Amino acid sequence: QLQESGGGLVQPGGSLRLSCAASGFTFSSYEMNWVRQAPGKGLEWVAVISYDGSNKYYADSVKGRFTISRDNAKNSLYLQMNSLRAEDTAVYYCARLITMVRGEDYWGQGTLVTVSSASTKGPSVFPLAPSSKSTSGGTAALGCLVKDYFPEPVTVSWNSGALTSGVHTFPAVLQSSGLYSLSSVVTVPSSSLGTQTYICNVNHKPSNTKVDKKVEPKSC
Amino acid sequence: FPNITNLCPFGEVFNATRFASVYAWNRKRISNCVADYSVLYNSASFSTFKCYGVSPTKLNDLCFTNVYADSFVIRGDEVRQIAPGQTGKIADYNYKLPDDFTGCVIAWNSNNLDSKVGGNYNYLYRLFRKSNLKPFERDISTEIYQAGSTPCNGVEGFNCYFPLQSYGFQPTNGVGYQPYRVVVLSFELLHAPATVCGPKKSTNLVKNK
Amino acid sequence: FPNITNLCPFGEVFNATRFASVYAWNRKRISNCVADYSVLYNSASFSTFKCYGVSPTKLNDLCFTNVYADSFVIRGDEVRQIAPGQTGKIADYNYKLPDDFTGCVIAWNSNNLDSKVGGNYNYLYRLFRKSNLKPFERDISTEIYQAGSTPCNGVEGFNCYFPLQSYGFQPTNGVGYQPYRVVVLSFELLHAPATVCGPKKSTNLVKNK
Amino acid sequence: DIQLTQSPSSLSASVGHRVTITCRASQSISSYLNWYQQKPGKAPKLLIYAASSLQSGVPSRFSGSGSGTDFTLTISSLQPEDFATYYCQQSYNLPRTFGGGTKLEVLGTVAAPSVFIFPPSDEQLKSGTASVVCLLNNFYPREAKVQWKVDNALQSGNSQESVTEQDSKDSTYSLSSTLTLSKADYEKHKVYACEVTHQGLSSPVTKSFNRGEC
Ligand SMILES: *[C@@H]1O[C@H](CO)[C@@H](O)[C@H](O)[C@H]1NC(C)=O
Ligand SMILES: *[C@@H]1O[C@H](CO)[C@@H](O)[C@H](O)[C@H]1NC(C)=O
Ligand SMILES: *[C@@H]1O[C@H](CO)[C@@H](O)[C@H](O)[C@H]1NC(C)=O
Ligand SMILES: *[C@@H]1O[C@H](CO)[C@@H](O)[C@H](O)[C@H]1NC(C)=O
């Protein structure tokens, strides 16, 4: 078992300290590594440290800026990160890497570091009314656009969960402003648009701002 | 014979719940007690009971300068290497007996204690070393072994190896790959002052005969 | 030791101007010479150098009655099949290794030698066969294959097929569709003098000590 | 620094097929090459070490081969739990480097193309901005293209897109995409559409959206 801690939002040029606690194996015997993964990218190694701390090595992207350390009495690995760039936004993982000798590998659950100058803001809420644009008989897409928030996790639904069947919520896009948006959609018969209430439910949990908003069909 | 009566703590050696890895073997010192070995050599438990410089049935007649009990787990096909003059990864890098060894090597299969359904990996042995181990030397280091010309700097890579490997023990293994618990009883039979003696009953002291 | 001469003719195997097709693979016998395998293994260009039962540094310390060197061209993604226990049209119909193979497999990309701008179709492989090859069997036959019930009578037809197909090596192919030159080295020890050996190293002389 | 190229960037396959993926090093690394599997939001799991040795408790259907510069991972008979992203990593020297992993992302075949589009909402308009929602939905290939029609000009650079993951039962994606325009732009122009181009069909598809004209 490995458990990383110390992530979250940071201002560019700032500092952070990651930590990782080890349980159920002899952590003190091994090299330990930091590896990262930027959102939607591949794996990238960051740094290694020897079993006793005597030797340390880094990727040239982070050398000088980051420091790796451990203490084996506390079964703990650390990464001091200084001069944080937007480039350093990633999940960071704590790992034992196999080379040429058989052994059990361990990777932690990973912790997310976000580096940007945006700040917490609520969901800009924008339901989509079909109004006989893009409809035919047994088909009409209801939709809901959500915008301009900085912490990632915004949750959405149709008709207070009663219209869950066939819902598509697309993964959030980071805009050039440094703020996120997503949209959420369901396909329903055009004749049914006057029957159900067609609320888009939206909840930005880090803002604690929840709002549920009506689609107004046939309106233009 | 001396007039002590407390029996030696062999139950604490043979019936311990966890044994050590063979690279990090346990040693217990046995002293100031009565050693009844018949509880060992009359047991049906043991797949090996090989004595060196002594015979098992004679042990209850003797006195011993000191006694050591050494304990570890190995494979069934490695029990061969726990004897004087042997060679192989265990004899060479984990546990060495002297050529002049006096003592007994005792082993039993423990596949019902030291194996787990997904594999048990708690037990390890040293795979690499610069030089062979001396008799009763122990090495618990975890420096990266340098197999070639370039320094490792405490990191695994090309020709740079972690020195220890695990025994993976599954209940389904063939018997040469099952775990064995090994006890080595080691002693000096030289007539130096002796605090361990067999269960012998002393007479009166008769003079001028 | 006497000074090193009569080196084995590996340059005739590795630097031949044209290689065999894999169905009609060449075999060269190496005997009565000094074999420096580490001069192969330390050379650049090998995309694969895999040894079974041996290591290149240990081969310089060993002697053999013969070495066989087998050579052919295959597709870059077929090199996977030149190993013990493999299956697929190369391993099954063209060139089979035994499961107890002692030897090395060497391969390199030859796109600049073995592709043509018009496509190179001089290299063939066996597409159809009755049954899988035995280890180190060869089959240069061109009898029309029968998938149907009728005797094909040496004429191609509905499901009567010519058994050999060409590769079409174009210089613009993707790397898995490019030509690879393969050498397999098999090491043979008989009840006979070991005529192939690694080179014996010498110190200087030291007189008057 | 050793560069690793993973040759198929994405694969599509069905349960019971054999699969192969390949990794190609910029210098010889002997047998020093690990393989990992990763699933969305989880950590990587080691499958193969050395270049061929199967890790403890990994299914015997996974196998590795290679020693030199060219390496392959195979999955002998593919299963519903194997649809993941796969990475090679060299173990030879520092820095430790990874290949850009192969996705194995179709869970099972179906032919189905499917295309649709949606307008920039009046309940969105209150933003002082326009945001179109081009919206091709439940189609089996990922591959598609989007175009725009504002006052019959074709817009570019001013766009973004997003895709939901390959559906567990359907093996279909859905895509959304957005042109966005200021108040000074979306009232100045009056004719609007997306157009969706997709190689599963003989033609693009387009529908009238008419922001500030309906
Ligand atoms: C036993 O031996 C000791 C000397 O070692 C002596 O003092 C003692 O009187 C003897 N008898 C008993 C019953 O202990
Ligand atoms: C270990 O415990 C069992 C059960 O009580 C017993 O039969 C055995 O003699 C003990 N072994 C030793 C060496 O005391
Ligand atoms: C090799 O040996 C021959 C005699 O066998 C000797 O004349 C020659 O000088 C030696 N070669 C070298 C380079 O020392
Ligand atoms: C093949 O030819 C090249 C160029 O002359 C040489 O470097 C290489 O060592 C040769 N290989 C063998 C096995 O002779």
Tab-separated table of C-alpha atoms in Angstrom, chain B:
chain	number	residue	atom	x	y	z
B	1	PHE	CA	26.945	-33.381	36.482
B	2	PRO	CA	25.699	-29.944	37.750
B	3	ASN	CA	22.486	-29.803	39.877
B	4	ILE	CA	20.314	-27.431	37.781
B	5	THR	CA	16.865	-28.758	36.630
B	6	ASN	CA	15.216	-26.231	34.211
B	7	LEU	CA	14.709	-27.739	30.705
B	8	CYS	CA	16.147	-25.921	27.645
B	9	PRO	CA	13.653	-23.765	25.629
B	10	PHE	CA	13.531	-25.829	22.376
B	11	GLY	CA	9.727	-25.264	22.088
B	12	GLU	CA	10.447	-21.516	21.625
B	13	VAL	CA	12.684	-22.442	18.607
B	14	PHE	CA	10.792	-25.280	16.873
B	15	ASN	CA	7.231	-23.926	17.575
B	16	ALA	CA	7.846	-20.210	16.812
B	17	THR	CA	5.032	-18.868	14.538
B	18	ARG	CA	7.274	-16.809	12.172
B	19	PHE	CA	10.715	-17.930	10.985
B	20	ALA	CA	13.284	-15.604	9.365
B	21	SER	CA	14.374	-15.234	5.730
B	22	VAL	CA	17.605	-17.200	5.044
B	23	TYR	CA	19.647	-14.015	4.340
B	24	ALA	CA	18.514	-12.577	7.739
B	25	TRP	CA	18.550	-15.842	9.759
B	26	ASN	CA	17.795	-15.921	13.522
B	27	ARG	CA	20.271	-17.122	16.183
B	28	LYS	CA	19.264	-18.098	19.738
B	29	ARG	CA	21.833	-18.834	22.492
B	30	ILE	CA	20.986	-21.812	24.734
B	31	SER	CA	22.741	-21.941	28.165
B	32	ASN	CA	22.279	-22.843	31.892
B	33	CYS	CA	19.651	-25.581	31.279
B	34	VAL	CA	19.007	-29.347	30.897
B	35	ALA	CA	18.827	-30.329	27.207
B	36	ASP	CA	16.589	-33.361	26.643
B	37	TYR	CA	17.114	-34.047	22.912
B	38	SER	CA	14.896	-37.169	22.961
B	39	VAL	CA	11.852	-34.878	22.485
B	40	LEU	CA	13.482	-34.009	19.104
B	41	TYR	CA	14.976	-37.318	17.826
B	42	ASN	CA	11.929	-39.414	18.978
B	43	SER	CA	9.543	-36.951	17.202
B	44	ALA	CA	7.932	-38.110	13.904
B	45	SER	CA	7.957	-34.477	12.560
B	46	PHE	CA	11.268	-34.101	10.739
B	47	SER	CA	12.183	-34.822	7.076
B	48	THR	CA	15.908	-34.296	7.928
B	49	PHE	CA	17.771	-34.902	11.216
B	50	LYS	CA	21.490	-35.061	10.282
B	51	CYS	CA	24.086	-34.809	13.070
B	52	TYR	CA	27.789	-34.078	12.451
B	53	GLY	CA	30.608	-35.164	14.814
B	54	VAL	CA	27.909	-36.776	17.084
B	55	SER	CA	25.016	-39.328	16.853
B	56	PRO	CA	21.409	-38.362	17.885
B	57	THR	CA	20.956	-41.180	20.448
B	58	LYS	CA	24.203	-40.111	22.278
B	59	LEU	CA	23.119	-36.446	22.828
B	60	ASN	CA	21.393	-37.088	26.210
B	61	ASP	CA	24.748	-38.344	27.672
B	62	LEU	CA	26.784	-35.225	26.759
B	63	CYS	CA	27.530	-31.729	28.063
B	64	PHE	CA	28.045	-28.796	25.677
B	65	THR	CA	30.160	-25.640	26.146
B	66	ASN	CA	27.469	-23.424	24.606
B	67	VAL	CA	24.574	-24.239	22.239
B	68	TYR	CA	23.267	-22.073	19.350
B	69	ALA	CA	19.966	-22.654	17.546
B	70	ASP	CA	19.809	-20.976	14.091
B	71	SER	CA	16.424	-20.718	12.240
B	72	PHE	CA	15.297	-19.828	8.674
B	73	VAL	CA	13.029	-20.860	5.715
B	74	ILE	CA	14.381	-22.206	2.341
B	75	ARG	CA	13.146	-24.415	-0.590
B	76	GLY	CA	12.981	-28.217	-0.238
B	77	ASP	CA	15.747	-28.680	-2.871
B	78	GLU	CA	18.045	-26.258	-0.931
B	79	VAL	CA	18.059	-28.327	2.335
B	80	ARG	CA	21.002	-30.180	0.657
B	81	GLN	CA	23.122	-26.984	0.996
B	82	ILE	CA	22.727	-26.890	4.827
B	83	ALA	CA	25.700	-29.217	5.392
B	84	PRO	CA	29.519	-28.828	5.770
B	85	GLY	CA	31.573	-28.159	2.589
B	86	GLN	CA	28.519	-27.485	0.300
B	87	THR	CA	28.158	-24.732	-2.374
B	88	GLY	CA	25.302	-22.940	-4.227
B	89	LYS	CA	23.404	-19.622	-3.636
B	90	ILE	CA	22.412	-20.537	-0.050
B	91	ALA	CA	25.795	-21.888	1.099
B	92	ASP	CA	27.718	-19.148	-0.782
B	93	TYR	CA	25.662	-15.973	0.005
B	94	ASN	CA	23.077	-16.713	2.754
B	95	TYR	CA	24.157	-19.290	5.394
B	96	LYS	CA	27.555	-21.086	5.590
B	97	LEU	CA	28.471	-23.990	7.913
B	98	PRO	CA	32.177	-24.524	8.817
B	99	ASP	CA	33.891	-27.669	7.404
B	100	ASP	CA	34.587	-28.843	11.010
B	101	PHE	CA	30.892	-28.393	12.064
B	102	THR	CA	29.674	-30.144	15.246
B	103	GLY	CA	25.889	-30.099	15.576
B	104	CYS	CA	22.603	-31.213	13.983
B	105	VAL	CA	20.638	-29.927	10.952
B	106	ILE	CA	16.868	-30.463	11.296
B	107	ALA	CA	14.209	-29.624	8.638
B	108	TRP	CA	10.430	-30.051	8.144
B	109	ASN	CA	8.102	-29.128	5.270
B	110	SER	CA	5.993	-26.061	6.197
B	111	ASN	CA	3.822	-25.667	3.023
B	112	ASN	CA	0.746	-25.527	5.369
B	113	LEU	CA	2.240	-22.515	7.333
B	114	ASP	CA	4.507	-20.627	4.867
B	115	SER	CA	2.358	-20.722	1.661
B	116	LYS	CA	-0.638	-18.578	0.598
B	117	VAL	CA	-3.196	-19.131	-2.255
B	118	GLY	CA	-1.983	-16.082	-4.300
B	119	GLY	CA	1.692	-16.890	-3.523
B	120	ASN	CA	3.514	-15.915	-0.310
B	121	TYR	CA	6.428	-13.466	-0.958
B	122	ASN	CA	7.441	-12.572	2.657
B	123	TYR	CA	10.592	-14.820	2.431
B	124	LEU	CA	13.799	-13.757	0.570
B	125	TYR	CA	17.343	-14.893	-0.234
B	126	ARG	CA	20.477	-13.084	-1.461
B	127	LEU	CA	21.051	-13.692	-5.172
B	128	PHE	CA	24.260	-11.611	-5.694
B	129	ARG	CA	27.421	-10.912	-3.615
B	130	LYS	CA	31.039	-9.786	-4.354
B	131	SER	CA	32.469	-12.724	-2.332
B	132	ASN	CA	31.402	-15.930	-0.566
B	133	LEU	CA	30.101	-15.660	3.008
B	134	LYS	CA	32.331	-16.906	5.932
B	135	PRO	CA	31.059	-19.620	8.377
B	136	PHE	CA	28.198	-18.165	10.502
B	137	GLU	CA	28.555	-14.690	8.863
B	138	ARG	CA	25.236	-12.766	8.371
B	139	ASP	CA	24.617	-10.040	5.753
B	140	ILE	CA	21.426	-7.901	5.925
B	141	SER	CA	22.648	-5.115	3.561
B	142	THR	CA	20.603	-3.829	0.543
B	143	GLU	CA	23.259	-1.948	-1.480
B	144	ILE	CA	22.738	-2.229	-5.282
B	145	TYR	CA	25.075	-4.962	-6.594
B	146	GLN	CA	27.470	-3.837	-9.369
B	147	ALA	CA	27.749	-6.709	-11.900
B	148	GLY	CA	29.940	-4.713	-14.399
B	149	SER	CA	32.450	-1.858	-14.886
B	150	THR	CA	30.377	1.320	-14.156
B	151	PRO	CA	29.351	2.517	-10.611
B	152	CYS	CA	25.658	2.080	-9.714
B	153	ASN	CA	25.344	5.145	-7.391
B	154	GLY	CA	22.596	3.397	-5.339
B	155	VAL	CA	20.252	2.995	-8.385
B	156	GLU	CA	19.251	-0.120	-10.404
B	157	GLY	CA	19.976	-0.073	-14.146
B	158	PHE	CA	22.246	-1.803	-16.681
B	159	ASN	CA	24.438	-4.268	-14.654
B	160	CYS	CA	23.093	-2.803	-11.342
B	161	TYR	CA	20.905	-5.248	-9.384
B	162	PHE	CA	18.857	-5.322	-6.183
B	163	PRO	CA	20.739	-8.076	-4.239
B	164	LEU	CA	17.728	-10.007	-2.759
B	165	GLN	CA	15.046	-12.126	-4.486
B	166	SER	CA	11.816	-13.565	-3.005
B	167	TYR	CA	10.662	-17.166	-2.773
B	168	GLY	CA	7.088	-17.146	-4.111
B	169	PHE	CA	5.432	-20.099	-2.309
B	170	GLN	CA	2.050	-21.477	-3.550
B	171	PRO	CA	0.298	-24.524	-1.898
B	172	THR	CA	0.338	-26.149	-5.414
B	173	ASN	CA	4.189	-26.241	-5.832
B	174	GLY	CA	6.176	-29.457	-6.468
B	175	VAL	CA	7.888	-30.577	-3.221
B	176	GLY	CA	11.418	-29.341	-4.169
B	177	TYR	CA	9.878	-25.802	-4.424
B	178	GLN	CA	7.817	-25.942	-1.179
B	179	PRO	CA	8.976	-24.067	1.996
B	180	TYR	CA	11.011	-25.893	4.655
B	181	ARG	CA	11.672	-24.611	8.178
B	182	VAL	CA	15.294	-25.410	9.116
B	183	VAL	CA	16.835	-25.437	12.613
B	184	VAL	CA	20.618	-25.797	12.975
B	185	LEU	CA	21.767	-26.824	16.467
B	186	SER	CA	25.465	-25.968	16.859
B	187	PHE	CA	27.765	-26.719	19.824
B	188	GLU	CA	31.351	-27.268	21.048
B	189	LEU	CA	32.106	-30.732	22.574
B	190	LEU	CA	35.573	-29.616	23.848
B	191	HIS	CA	35.930	-29.986	27.684
B	192	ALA	CA	35.764	-26.244	28.455
B	193	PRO	CA	33.256	-25.189	31.238
B	194	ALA	CA	29.772	-26.407	30.183
B	195	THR	CA	26.341	-24.914	31.128
B	196	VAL	CA	24.157	-27.234	28.964
B	197	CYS	CA	23.949	-30.936	29.857
B	198	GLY	CA	21.729	-33.899	28.936
B	199	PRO	CA	19.166	-35.400	31.434
B	200	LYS	CA	21.761	-37.666	33.216
B	201	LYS	CA	21.283	-38.567	36.933
B	202	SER	CA	24.397	-38.150	39.144
B	203	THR	CA	25.727	-40.595	41.801
B	204	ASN	CA	27.555	-39.951	45.077
B	205	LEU	CA	31.303	-39.151	44.867
B	206	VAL	CA	33.377	-42.287	45.693
B	207	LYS	CA	37.108	-41.962	46.566
B	208	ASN	CA	40.055	-44.426	46.732
B	209	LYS	CA	38.475	-46.910	44.178
